[PDB]
């Protein structure tokens, strides 16, 4: 019921200078952890369904699991398809009522990225769905080559995405060496592109930086690994202290609770607590 | 879609001398493990939703998770409420379309057990739902006091349950000492009561015995702990060999696969493989 | 979404001295007419699904049609099964989420009426569903024999229904001769039984009387025929003025609008306008 | 459940030389009439939801009403959006799971018609949905100007529609003067375009012609008015013979039955009877 468009949700966050957390879920406990956190914090949230889980559980199943856990949830929730490299898949998530989608054409040429992102964005706008795209390949944890201020402009204008993902120092996974953001590029994009920014790979970015990025117009911070670290630090404590504990409400329940904490941390860091 | 009444499903198993496995699920992977096994084995199955999971996830959520994973499932599935000690809860599961239910009044006097089991059985029959009850307190892992052949008769006649759970040597949890069934009582009940029997606490019963029990009219064997042992032997192998593995598709995916095996084992032991 | 228990809805009406209209629907337009009226009048309402429509369209279909028209409806709606003479049917409507039900055992002996009404009421209370029963056969349009004040008491106490239907001068269909209510019996029942009353066959009762009955504790007034008169006075005006008008949005659309008026009339007469 | 893609359904009809009837529904009875006919005739069918009903009942409601009446239906059904002049509306029907859609750009220039039809067709193909478009304005009941064989080719190639609607002598409504088809154009299109054809305004086309058109590659015949004529010839017989008949199961029930006949007529004429 309290499913809110992602255009609406990112825009509000932007206008009022907070970022919304995009928390990747992989199963039931994780979905619930996320929804519990947000509710306890009176915070709007995005649940992210990404390519990894999609291959395990499936698109449609995972939407339905999220739907199942929304009964006592009064705060704004938006379901987001992450890193879709397929128009069909983008079209599928729309069809089962995702409230936001991201078509990632970063591995395609400028022309082709733009052509498909636009096609998917036209559909999303038609049905009131937040639309994300990416310009600039974001890696996964050796000179340097970031995203142009101009590339961004043209991409944004050509695709009419609601929120733009740029490559700006983040990467996917447990960071080897503390990275550093191009706060400068962010400044320029803020002024040129006049659109909210998405930071991929915010797991492992120092808090200082995150809040600095949110100040330069970042309104969506994706969180995946940090949450799985926490969930796994839970499974472990229990499982390596007592391996003969067979109650999944404890072993994975403690995985959940610890991950619930991690979300609340991030909600606060992003400053959305209070904002429902 | 392929949800089949539990009256129908246990009766067929009984008539044709196999037992259906009642596999307790606690989350998504577990639900899927069960459904994968059954499908690979062309076997009808029961998914059990019991009081423990209900307190974690909820009745309605867990039914909806099962529904979500039924898209590619062609074999007969029945959803079973386990060990309900409440009429309201029994009525709730009916309302969201469980295909079987068990009201456990074993902790109530004969009169009160019968009165409520009957009330719930009247509702279940009305909407074509398999109905289970229990006479005789089944423990959880010191002289002896089993279920009377006559108690059984009166209980069965008074309640009109479809399948009867009797206390006959089983118990809930990791068995301390290899138990032994009253195959004799089973013989008498088979002849007197003329109704299928449910064996609670079949996790840890030697195979020989299980097949012997299925021969004396057991048509439903409940499996919970053994499945969680397996799922936890999975989480562990991965997690204690590599604690920095943060991919839940691996750590809990291997929990799933190992548990998928355990189900298939039991399906075969119970002899339902082939029977869709 | 805005589906409200009928125990809650009739009780509020009772406490605050208004009656809720129970409007029988037979198809889409009729369902919508009812929902449109109520919404325009900020009034809680009951949609009644009765034995006639059930035989045409079915229980489950008609609930789903009502569900389909609830998208823009913000006021309290309750779906009511009317004149069910079957436990199975009563149990079916519960299972697909009716918010009120009536088991009519008026054609059964006191003992049997009470036994089944009680059984159904136990289920309804369990799942928070308004429960209605009837004592005294209400006819369908020649000395006299109404409902006892004492019969009512015992019936009410034995069944624990939320709202009681008594035979008090009403009848089903286009009234041959202006009838007259036993306002006296109503007075006694009000004081003895301490429970809301349902008036069957309020189509064709003079307004004066209706408001008088609502004053003596009637909180539910059933409306069926008057609504079908109106809907048919619509189909006719159009169809007999222009028989070659083939647009169902006009011929049956005007059936709808005229019936929308009739509802609003009744909402006002019953005094629920404003009460959401 | 037995909802079948319209690409699949029209193609089979084409390959095997029958046409599928596209029957416009406006309410419950009409939906049911259609589904009853088809089922009695073991025939695949298309239910059409068009702009008129959409303004009365709404897209999403009408899909849900059709869903509600599909419980006992074993034959192939496809839900078709008719004469959509909006991308948003086309995208909406996809989102609630129509199995076929028609974007009508006949009132747009060649370039713009093609551009939007293509955009919608790309989405439809992505989610396995039959796609229809129109080249050549089809009127609604004075020299002559039909559809070019070449216009058709280019349109078809540019849009990749599954089935093409051409202007070929039909028109919407009660035909003033018996029209005549360009069977010749049909011949040419059959050979050039290699795609199934849709005949709009088949209500009032002599049977001879219909079967002749089906022979030249027409695989979809739209029926609306004839069905409403019949439904209204029903309402009338009853209503003008007895105006004081207030039972909607009779007055509109007889509207239904008569319309059920009309469908069966057409199913046979189109030759789909038997083909499930
Ligand atoms: Zn990313
Ligand atoms: Zn990325
Ligand atoms: Zn047990
Ligand atoms: Zn037990
Ligand atoms: Zn009545
Ligand atoms: Zn009555
Ligand atoms: Zn047309
Ligand atoms: Zn047309």
């Amino acid at each position: 019921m309290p499913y809110v468009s992602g255009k609406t949700m990112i825009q509000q966050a932007w206008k009022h200078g907070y970022a919304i957390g995009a928390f990747s879920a992989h199963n039931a406990e994780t979905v619930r952890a996320i929804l519990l956190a947000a509710q306890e914090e009176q915070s709007p949230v995005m649940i992210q369904v990404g390519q990894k889980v999609i291959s395990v559980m499936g698109l449609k199943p995972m939407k339905e699991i999220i739907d199942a856990f929304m009964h006592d949830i009064t705060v704004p929730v938006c379901i987001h398809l992450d890193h879709s490299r397929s128009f069909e898949q983008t079209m599928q998530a729309i069809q089962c009522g995702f409230q936001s989608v991201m078509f990632d054409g970063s591995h395609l040429s400028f022309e082709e990225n733009v052509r498909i992102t636009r096609a998917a964005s036209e559909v999303a706008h038609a049905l009131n769905i937040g639309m994300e795209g990416e310009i600039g390949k974001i890696g996964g944890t050796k000179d340097a080559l970031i995203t142009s201020c101009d590339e961004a402009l043209r991409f944004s204008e050509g695709t009419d995405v609601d929120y733009l993902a740029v490559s700006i120092g983040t990467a996917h996974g447990v960071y080897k060496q503390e990275p550093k953001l191009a706060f400068g590029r962010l400044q320029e994009i803020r002024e040129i592109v006049k659109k909210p920014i998405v930071l991929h790979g915010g797991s492992g970015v120092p808090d200082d930086q995150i809040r600095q990025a949110i100040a330069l117009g970042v309104a969506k911070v994706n969180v995946d690994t940090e949450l799985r670290q926490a969930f796994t630090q839970g499974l472990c404590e229990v499982l390596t202290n007592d391996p003969e504990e067979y109650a999944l409400a404890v072993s994975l329940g403690h995985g959940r609770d610890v991950m619930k904490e991690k979300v609340i941390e991030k909600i606060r860091l992003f400053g959305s607590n209070g904002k429902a």
Side-chain angles (χ1 to χ4, degrees), chain A residues 2-6 8-14 16-19 21-51 53-59 61-87 89-136 138-140 144 147 149-150 152 154-156 158-163 165-166 168-169 171-173 179 182 184 186 193 195-198 200-207 209-210 213-215 217-228 230-232 234 236 238 240 242-243 245-251 253-260 263-276:
Chain A
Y3 281 153
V4 182
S5 171
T8 299
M9 193 185 277
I10 304 298
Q11 213 63 250
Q12 218 61 256
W14 203 54
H16 291 92
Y18 58 94
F23 301 106
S24 309
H26 301 75
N27 69 3
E29 301 96 326
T30 56
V31 158
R32 240 319 227 227
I34 298 161
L35 293 176
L36 287 178
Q39 183 70 41
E40 288 179 27
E41 292 282 310
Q42 284 304 312
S43 145
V45 69
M46 275 183 183
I47 299 211
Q48 259 178 167
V49 175
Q51 303 311 306
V53 64
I54 287 186
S55 57
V56 179
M57 305 273 181
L59 253 186
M62 267 286 303
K63 164 92 199 325
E64 290 176 6
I65 299 164
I66 302 158
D67 290 351
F69 284 118
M70 280 287 299
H71 49 275
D72 50 356
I73 297 295
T74 69
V75 300
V77 183
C78 168
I79 306 181
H80 181 77
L81 178 75
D82 196 12
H83 283 301
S84 173
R85 316 272 219 180
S86 189
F87 190 80
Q89 194 199 72
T90 310
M91 289 308 102
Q92 280 166 20
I94 288 175
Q95 182 176 248
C96 66
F98 277 61
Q99 297 82 34
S100 162
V101 293
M102 174 210 196
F103 183 72
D104 180 359
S106 56
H107 64 302
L108 307 169
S109 63
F110 189 67
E111 288 79 27
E112 277 293 280
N113 183 359
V114 162
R115 188 192 52 94
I116 312 182
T117 315
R118 191 197 221 203
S121 85
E122 278 176 50
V123 185
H125 297 333
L127 296 158
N128 316 125
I129 292 161
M131 178 71 202
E132 181 186 314
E134 184 167 305
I135 182 68
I138 293 197
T147 300
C149 180
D150 159 63
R154 247 138 7 80
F155 187 77
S156 172
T159 64
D160 193 43
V161 290
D162 302 312
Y163 21 100
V166 299
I168 212 158
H172 289 103
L186 265 159
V193 201
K195 257 168 197 172
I197 309 304
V198 180
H200 289 237
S203 288
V205 180
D207 296 13
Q209 308 203 236
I210 284 290
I214 288 171
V218 162
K220 184 183 179 268
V221 186
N222 300 0
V223 203
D224 180 20
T225 317
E226 252 186 300
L227 302 181
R228 279 181 296 112
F231 190 78
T232 310
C236 283
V238 177
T240 75
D242 184 355
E245 172 68 74
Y246 292 157
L248 299 196
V250 179
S251 64
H254 191 61
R256 159 171 138 287
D257 286 314
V258 65
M259 170 178 177
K260 189 179 82 210
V263 179
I264 288 156
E265 203 192 338
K266 298 302 205 174
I267 295 169
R268 293 178 172 181
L269 175 62
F270 300 159
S272 62
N273 61 286
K275 297 299 181 314

